[PDB]
Amino acid sequence: IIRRSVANRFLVLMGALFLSIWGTWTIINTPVDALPDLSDVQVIIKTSYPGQAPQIVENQVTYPLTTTMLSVPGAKTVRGFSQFGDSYVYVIFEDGTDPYWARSRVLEYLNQVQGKLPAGVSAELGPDATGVGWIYEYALVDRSGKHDLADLRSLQDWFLKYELKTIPDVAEVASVGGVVKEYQVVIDPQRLAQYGISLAEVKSALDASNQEAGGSSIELAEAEYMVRASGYLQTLDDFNHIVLKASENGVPVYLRDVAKVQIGPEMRRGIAELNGEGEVAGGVVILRSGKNAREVIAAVKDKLETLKSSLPEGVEIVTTYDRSQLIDRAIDNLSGKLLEEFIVVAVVCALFLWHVRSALVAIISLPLGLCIAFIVMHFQGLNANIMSLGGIAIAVGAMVDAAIVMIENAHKRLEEWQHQKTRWQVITDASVEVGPALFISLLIITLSFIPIFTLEGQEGRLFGPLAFTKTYAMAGAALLAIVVIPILMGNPLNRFLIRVYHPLLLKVLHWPKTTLLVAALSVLTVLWPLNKVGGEFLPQINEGDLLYMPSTLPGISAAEAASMLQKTDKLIMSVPEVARVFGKTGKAETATDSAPLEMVETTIQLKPQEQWRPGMTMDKIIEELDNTVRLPGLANLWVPPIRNRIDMLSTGIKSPIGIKVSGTVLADIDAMAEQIEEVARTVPGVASALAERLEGGRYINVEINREKAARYGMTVADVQLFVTSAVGGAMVGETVEGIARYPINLRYPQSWRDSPQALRQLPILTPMKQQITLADVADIKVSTGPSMLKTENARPTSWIYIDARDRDMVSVVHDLQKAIAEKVQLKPGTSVAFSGQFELLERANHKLKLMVPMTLMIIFVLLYLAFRRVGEALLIISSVPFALVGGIWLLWWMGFHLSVATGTGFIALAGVAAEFGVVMLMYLRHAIEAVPSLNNPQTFSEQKLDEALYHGAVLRVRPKAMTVAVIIAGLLPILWGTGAGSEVMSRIAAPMIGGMITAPLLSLFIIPAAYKLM
Amino acid sequence: LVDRSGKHDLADLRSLQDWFLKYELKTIPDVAEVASVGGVVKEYQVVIDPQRLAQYGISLAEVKSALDASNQEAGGSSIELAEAEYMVRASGYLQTLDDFN
Amino acid sequence: AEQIEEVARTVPGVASALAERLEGGRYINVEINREKAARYGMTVADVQLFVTSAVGGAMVGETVEGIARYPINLRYPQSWRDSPQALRQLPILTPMKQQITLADVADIKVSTGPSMLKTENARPTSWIYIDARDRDMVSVVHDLQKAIAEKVQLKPGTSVAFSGQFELLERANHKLKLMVPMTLMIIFVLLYLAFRRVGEA
Amino acid sequence: DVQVIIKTSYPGQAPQIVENQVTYPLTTTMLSVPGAKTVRGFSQFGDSYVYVIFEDGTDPYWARSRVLEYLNQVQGKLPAGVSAELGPDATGVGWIYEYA
Amino acid sequence: EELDNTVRLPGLANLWVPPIRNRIDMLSTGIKSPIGIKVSGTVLADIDAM
Ligand SMILES: [Ag+]
């Protein structure tokens, strides 16, 4: 046992050095962010569909993607954002699944379908990254008015993209905003009516007139020759001279003679601004999921610096989101604090048994002891995000104790032989009478920690990292305790504490029952912060740069929304701390930004809090700010970066509930959405149901009269020709200019298309060379409709998010199914399903009451091991709840919130107080040999029981005093601040400490006082 | 699938199994596919009539040309009207037997 | 590829740079005159029809003979396609049932060009292999970046990168001086084991 | 090393043009696939060969499929027929026996 | 048996089998049989006359 480990003895130093050299290589090598990748497991499947409409972008394009994907393995959900001009469809399975499986599998059924969707409009398949995946994001700038918007985006686009994606672990690099060169032929309905050429003639001509072909080798003067055809439509000259009517031996109508070819701006879909000055186009860098955010960035900056030249003139590159930085303010946080943990331990070790040895050996031991913790992430993968790095800090605390035990019991058996090579063999023996209570106890605290960690859901994916990290920080300390033994080799206050202590031993004795009584007091007083809990649960954290994102009502135009951003972006520059701002509104040219145009985002660089305002907690910024922007129709949500991104795609329900309602047609799930909304108000559920908040958006219906098509002898389809190409500006043909190819657009001028009435008057010229007007072949009616559609499983479903805050309401949900079932109407073919973040909270509760009982079954098939008798075990167990009481109370003071952050402090707590209770239960149990050395047994008791105590009593206030000091000394530094987010490590330090003030104090009276009884 | 009354139609059934049943199951953990068998599937049938076709003068490459074309739906942009931007739509989904004839 | 070739000779690098050794190959350009297409009332595309199918012998349709299917080719005879001048004279017959000749709708110019293209990452790149045999020249490479950076011209949107079997030989040298020292750290934490004293080791 | 050959038989054409209308949607699409090592192209006359290679020693029947993701998507940005072949399964050592 | 006879129409060689079996072999293409000469080669006439 503790013998063979000391026979391997000489081996460990080499075992140890093996670990030093090794640890220092992989350490500086880890991945290292924060904010664990999840948003679960997903595969985005975009379909760029230039211009269309959400009833119809749904029908002819999303329908063969929602639908085919029911039929692929991983058949989890085929859940669809199918909007205007785009069709996004996300399939997600179960958490933690080897995605490059999850990828390909999906793929099987995407290929098959490119025939059930139209022409072009080919379906994109995700990237490779999450939403966390947007590392760095730059903007493009001009220092002179000599450079053009069009010139820029192309530059970002045909010169920048090539320059980055060539970068190890950058996946994709999506350009945002600006404007894209657009060759536009503007048909002119007068010149078109004189000369006699239909659209199916121009568009017929255009598709044809812009190619390049070759046809063989000519065997000339022996060096064989290849033959080539010219045709790349590149000179505006070559445009104007396309031929339409070809009057032989006379004039040919040229294109010039029916339309006016002008270079213009693509229909805009993602617009970007940058303070007052810049409406501009720049791009972002999405991280090829699973790779050190930091290093990618390096390779980028370095390539950018390299690149700082190849530009033209007047175009700096500004950085709007250097995710690198928030990685450093935090990494240094934990770089400093752990060296600071040393300054505190040096203090208190040095202060207690004067003239220390242990801290110096231990510090060298830890970075290596850490050099192991992350190779074991290496054995079964993880994330060095701060959650994990939350495992490393407690690690210190759980590592503090053990060096301490070897440190104190060697003080006993070093001073007894100084009252009297082999001085050494006698010191190891000391750590044998007490021994295992250190090694073992460590083990105890660790598995006692794992059962709360395994949880799955959205949140359980969110602790999964930390969870593991402790597991590995323990392995270190666990077998460290056992090997924090071999490594070491290579006054006045105690008196007053001891005197203050002999009256309570003569008073925990003076009264047996009283411990149970003062016990029912403190463990029930706890119930006042154990029910009021201050308020709120798991929120917060700190970005460096904030994301404005509002609640905008659906419809708004494209020029206003470009100014309404010029403006918003104008006044957010007001407050001085803000270093740069960036408002990209609409998609971001990546399948991650499924953002419409009324969705306005804005990255907000903030200057180091080193300067610029007296006070202003991040919450005073938000406030003042939140008011520095009070325009109408804007419900403004302000959020950090990662969060905005990560939830932005974790589709489903922030909400706790919602009645999904499926079944085959809009009328069913629309009228339904109505029929039920009322149920929420009467029933005992605080209510706010919204059948349809999406369906806002206004259309211009164009009902061709069928019959009215026949007479005119025009095929309905042919009409379309004049609704799509003629009016919107539907495009045909892409000009090609090497590497980069720009698009050619063909439609009636800026005007005839300029209003419903103007549109009733559209000038149409049928195949029977006759002149009409659209109004004449169709009823142009206005109308109101949807600006989106969600979709769970091919069919149409309306998932009505709902909540009754600050409760647990599994009860209300059960009552509703019975109630509907007794009097409500389901139309032809339809079904209802329920879901939210509730099913997730109820599944975990069900498995947590099975892992905490399972953590106690293994705890008690270990609470009894080293010492035999049950009474002791029950004693450590009535002993912890007091620790928890001192702890949890530390919370009400601050009026906290609790979480899975507190939910962990609680857990190293109950482990460590358990650890000090068992050693104090031990200083009173191995010694049936202390009992009889004094023994006067026969008439039982005496002043001898009293004196079988005050010896193990005075010994416990040297080890436990300076250990409960540092324990209370590390769980603090992180509390009163964190220039690098530590709402996390505070929220875990919270109840562990209160546990400490209360806990050591409880070590002294349980061992005497549950012992008396049992 | 079964009918307890002669009020329901074979065609009505298979579609029900097909456009309402399939959705209701494949949404089930480890059910792969759920294949419908037998019945009958609604089939819009134009029956060319070789006499009326011979009088009027329209070849098949004319009817079939016409049919492929006459059953769509297209849209072409947003109209910037009273500030709330508008989208424009084309009707054409071949749904009324009236629209067929 | 031209502008830089000279840098190799003066600098301390034994030199032989070849901007382009590939670009050998001779073409017969067929510049359709656009305008000259309209009058004749023929769509440029339609011209193509007579450059590709008519002349090379571009194929259409595959005959099928069970298991195996052979291909059907359609073009002007072995002759009319038989020489640049013969080709200036190609006989063309437009949609306006009129008779012309290619020369008449296009300038058939001869020309010289590439018989290949390499390509690193979508764009076009010219990777000019180079060497100064029988040395290790990590030193020469460093001096060149500084030198170009002080007086050379980069046109609109462009970048230069370096590579070879050198980066491979330099990465290994860097890891070999880390595995041979690591092989001795474990060797000496084993050179001393069985016998104790350092002098022996 | 580790490679995936991606041929495109293009009966007759020309390297300015066998590059433009056929190799361009294969060089280009493949920037956007994982294993984003290099999209390095021999694009000649009548053929367009494009080899993607990652890092040494990688389970290729991964390396295969991954590539594949973006080859399917593009058969519309290249012409008629001239469909794009995807390697074999062998190396260059792979030519064992050869008869006449 | 009784069943096998409750169904004696013409042209029907009736095979009666369990469910799984019917399914599992129904696709284990090849040969229930122990042997069979496969004969390949490029056209119907060869492998038909063969
Ligand atoms: Ag958003």
Same domain for A66 and A136, yes or no, is yes
- What does the alpha-carbon distance between residue A667 and residue A56 come to, in Å, rounded to a whole number? 16
Residue A458 CA to ligand 1 center (angstroms) comes to 19
Residue A600 CA to ligand 1 center (angstroms) comes to 7
3-state secondary structure of A58: helix
User: Could C35 and A241 be called an inter-chain contact, meaning their C-beta atoms sit closer than 8 Å?
Assistant: yes
Please name the member of C57, C117, C122 whose beta carbon is closest to the beta carbon of D28: C122
Q: Which of A751, A769, A785 is the last residue of a domain?
A: A785
- What does the alpha-carbon distance between residue A216 and residue C73 come to, in Å, rounded to a whole number? 13
Q: How distant is the Cα of C135 from the closest Cα of chain D, in angstroms? A: 26
Residue A283 · residue A138 · CB < 8 Å: yes
* Cα C176 off chain centre by: 35
Residue D37 · residue D53 · CB < 8 Å: yes
Pairing state between β A698-704 and B86-90: parallel
- Residue C112: phi and psi, rounded to 5, are -120, 140
Handedness of CA A713, A716, A722, A723 (dihedral sign): positive
Largest CA distance in chain C: 106
Give the helix/strand (H/E) hosting A976. Answer: none
* Chain A residues inside the 8 Å CB shell of D72: 107, 110-111
Same domain for A134 and A48, yes or no, is yes
Interface residue of C23, C62, C119 to substitute, partner D, most D CBs within 10 Å: C119
- What does the alpha-carbon distance between residue A799 and residue A836 come to, in Å, rounded to a whole number? 10
**Per-residue tokens: A116:** 């059930």
List the chains bordering chain E where 3 or more Cβ pairs fall under 8 Å: C
> Which CA distances in Å does C67 have to A210, A239, A303, D83, E43?
39, 48, 55, 20, 7
Same domain for A990 and A845, yes or no, is yes
Same domain for A644 and A754, yes or no, is no
Nearest partner of A108 among A95, A125, A121, A92, judged by Cα = A125
Does E contact D via 3+ CB–CB distances below 8 Å? Answer: no
* Chain E residues inside the 8 Å CB shell of C67: 42-43
- What does the alpha-carbon distance between residue A979 and residue A987 come to, in Å, rounded to a whole number? 15
Residue A469 · residue A389 · CB < 8 Å: yes
Q: How distant is the Cα of D37 from the closest Cα of chain C, in angstroms? A: 10
**Per-residue tokens: A253:** 């109508």
- What does the alpha-carbon distance between residue A816 and residue A813 come to, in Å, rounded to a whole number? 5
Same domain for A861 and A916, yes or no, is yes
Q: Which of A723, A754, A785 is the last residue of a domain?
A: A785
User: Could B24 and A831 be called an inter-chain contact, meaning their C-beta atoms sit closer than 8 Å?
Assistant: yes
User: Could A21 and C185 be called an inter-chain contact, meaning their C-beta atoms sit closer than 8 Å?
Assistant: yes
Same domain for A305 and A375, yes or no, is no
* Cα A736 off chain centre by: 41
H-type alpha helices, E1-50: 2-5, 19-27, 44-49
List the chains bordering chain D where 3 or more Cβ pairs fall under 8 Å: A, C
**Contact pairs from chain A to chain B, CB under 8 Å:** 136
DSSP state of A374: T
Nearest partner of C115 among A232, D22, D24, D19, judged by Cα = D19
* Cα A58 off chain centre by: 29
3-state secondary structure of A699: strand
User: Could D17 and A228 be called an inter-chain contact, meaning their C-beta atoms sit closer than 8 Å?
Assistant: yes
Interacting residues of A1007 by C-beta distance below 8 A, sequence separation 6+? A875, A917, A920, A921, A923, A924
What is the DSSP code string of A412-444?
A: HHHHSTT---HHHHHHHHHHHHSGGGTHHHHHH
Strand partners, C91: C101
In one-letter notation, the amino acid at residue A651 is T
Give the helix/strand (H/E) hosting A275. Answer: none
Count Cβ atoms below 10 Å from residue A257 Cβ, excluding itself: 17
Give the helix/strand (H/E) hosting A189. Answer: none
- What does the alpha-carbon distance between residue A978 and residue A618 come to, in Å, rounded to a whole number? 12
Same domain for A351 and A366, yes or no, is yes
Q: Which residue in C has a C-alpha nearest to residue A308's C-alpha?
A: C159
- Judged by a CB distance cut-off of 8 A, whether residue C70 touches chain E is no
Same domain for A478 and A501, yes or no, is yes
What residues of chain A, 826 to 865, have a C-beta less than 8 Å from chain B? 829-831
Q: Which of A811, A837, A863 is the last residue of a domain?
A: A837
What ranges make up the beta strands (E) of A219-316? 225-229, 243-246, 252-254, 262-265, 270-274, 278-279, 282-286
Interacting residues of A205 by C-beta distance below 8 A, sequence separation 6+? A242, A243, A244, A255, C43
Q: How distant is the Cα of C123 from the closest Cα of chain D, in angstroms? A: 8
Please name the member of A104, A166, A738 whose beta carbon is closest to the beta carbon of D65: A104
B54: left (phi over 0), alpha (psi -120 to 50) or beta: alpha
3-state secondary structure of C101: strand
Q: Give, in degrees to the nearest 5, the angle at Cα A843 between A840 and A849.
A: 135
Interface residue of D9, D33, D45, D49 to substitute, partner C, most C CBs within 10 Å: D45
**Per-residue tokens: A439:** 């090694």
**Per-residue tokens: A707:** 């019959």
In one-letter notation, the amino acid at residue C47 is V
Burial classification of residue C100, based on how many CB atoms lie within 10 Å of its CB (0-12 exposed, 13-18 middle, 19 or more buried): middle
- Judged by a CB distance cut-off of 8 A, whether residue D15 touches chain C is yes
- Helices (H) and strands (E) in chain E — how many of each? 3, 0
Same domain for A42 and A27, yes or no, is no
- What does the alpha-carbon distance between residue C143 and residue C87 come to, in Å, rounded to a whole number? 54
Interacting residues of A190 by C-beta distance below 8 A, sequence separation 6+? none
User: Could A166 and C121 be called an inter-chain contact, meaning their C-beta atoms sit closer than 8 Å?
Assistant: yes
Nearest partner of A192 among A183, A207, A202, judged by Cα = A202
* Chain C residues inside the 8 Å CB shell of A242: 38
**Per-residue tokens: A884:** 């928890």
In one-letter notation, the amino acid at residue A502 is H
**Per-residue tokens: D86:** 């995807």
* Cα A809 off chain centre by: 26
Interacting residues of C178 by C-beta distance below 8 A, sequence separation 6+? none
Does D contact B via 3+ CB–CB distances below 8 Å? Answer: no
- What does the alpha-carbon distance between residue A130 and residue A132 come to, in Å, rounded to a whole number? 5
Strand partners, A79: A90, A792
Domain that holds residue A520: 1-36+323-536+838-1014
Q: How distant is the Cα of A554 from the closest Cα of chain B, in angstroms? A: 9
SS3 content of chain C, % helix, strand, coil (to 5): 35, 15, 50
Same domain for A99 and A167, yes or no, is yes
**Per-residue tokens: B59:** 């070849």
- What does the alpha-carbon distance between residue A535 and residue A897 come to, in Å, rounded to a whole number? 5
Burial classification of residue A522, based on how many CB atoms lie within 10 Å of its CB (0-12 exposed, 13-18 middle, 19 or more buried): middle
The radius of gyration of chain D's CA atoms, rounded to the nearest angstrom, is 14
**Per-residue tokens: A654:** 């922030």
**Per-residue tokens: A221:** 């003067």
Residue A237 · residue C65 · CB < 8 Å: no
Burial classification of residue A566, based on how many CB atoms lie within 10 Å of its CB (0-12 exposed, 13-18 middle, 19 or more buried): middle
> Which CA distances in Å does A120 have to A115, A183, A563?
10, 19, 32
* Cα A258 off chain centre by: 55
Residue A41 · residue A93 · CB < 8 Å: yes
DSSP state of A532: S
Interacting residues of A807 by C-beta distance below 8 A, sequence separation 6+? none
- Residue A590: phi and psi, rounded to 5, are -145, 155
Interacting residues of A788 by C-beta distance below 8 A, sequence separation 6+? A54, A81, A82, A83, A554, A596, A694, A697
A806: left (phi over 0), alpha (psi -120 to 50) or beta: left
Count Cβ atoms below 10 Å from residue E18 Cβ, excluding itself: 8
Q: Tokens 């069913």 identify what position? A: A668
Strand partners, A254: A243
Same domain for A669 and A755, yes or no, is no
Does C contact B via 3+ CB–CB distances below 8 Å? Answer: no
Same domain for A983 and A1013, yes or no, is yes
First to last CA, chain A: 31
Handedness of CA A937, A938, A942, A945 (dihedral sign): positive
**Per-residue tokens: A316:** 């700096």
**Per-residue tokens: A238:** 């070559």
* Chain B residues inside the 8 Å CB shell of A664: 19-20, 23
> Which CA distances in Å does D64 have to A102, A112, A114, D52?
15, 19, 22, 10
Q: Give, in degrees to the nearest 5, the angle at Cα A926 between A922 and A929.
A: 135
**Per-residue tokens: C42:** 């023929």
Report resolution (Å) to 1 decimal. Answer: 4.4
Q: How many domains does chain A divide into?
A: 3
Please name the member of B20, B84, B99 whose beta carbon is closest to the beta carbon of A706: B99
* Elucidation technique: X-ray
- What does the alpha-carbon distance between residue C72 and residue C59 come to, in Å, rounded to a whole number? 6
- What does the alpha-carbon distance between residue A704 and residue A780 come to, in Å, rounded to a whole number? 8
